[PDB]
Amino acid sequence: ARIAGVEIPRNKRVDVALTYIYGIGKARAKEALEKTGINPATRVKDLTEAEVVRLREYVENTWKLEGELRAEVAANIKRLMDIGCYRGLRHRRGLPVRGQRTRTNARTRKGPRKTV
């Protein structure tokens, strides 16, 4: 459980492996290795222990990540479901939130088909 709590894949490049963390995409992969000056092509198996703790430190003190990011996203959805706004109700039903039609599709939010 190295950085940042996720044992990021070795064998792959550092810019890729960082994306296997909740809160770090491609955009923040380009960012973290620019501040700490690491070749984004170097594999995680070849990080020098200084490079690791350098890359670990900036990553964790700058952005909210894994556990704490999950709590906030939930807490935001929770309060939307608590003030009782329209986006809140759709979370209280599992129904979509961004105005999409529900007469057909919407199977990502609904789940696989419920036969009658």
Binding site: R79, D82, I83, G84, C85, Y86, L89
Partner: protein
């Protein structure tokens, strides 16, 4: 959402009643057909009846619900599932 460069929209006719109540030592139940109007902190604590197309829905306004619109609190479609 609405451009930050412009203002926080309130219909100004609904907004007049908010400040006239704040001064007088509010409040009284405000009937409005303004779903498009933003909640603004001057409104916190009041209760405003919002028209959903059929009825004016009395909604009490709290600290947490300020960035929203009044329509988000008076839903327009009655629905209780199928079956």
């Amino acid at each position: 959402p609405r451009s930050l460069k412009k203002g926080v929209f309130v219909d100004d006719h609904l907004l007049e009643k908010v400040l006239e109540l704040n001064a007088k030592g509010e409040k009284r139940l405000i009937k409005t057909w303004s779903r498009r109007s933003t909640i603004v902190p001057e409104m916190v604590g009041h209760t405003i009846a919002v028209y959903n197309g059929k009825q004016h829905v009395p909604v009490y306004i709290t600290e947490n619900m300020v960035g929203h619109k009044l329509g988000e609190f008076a839903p327009t479609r009655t629905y209780r599932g199928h079956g």
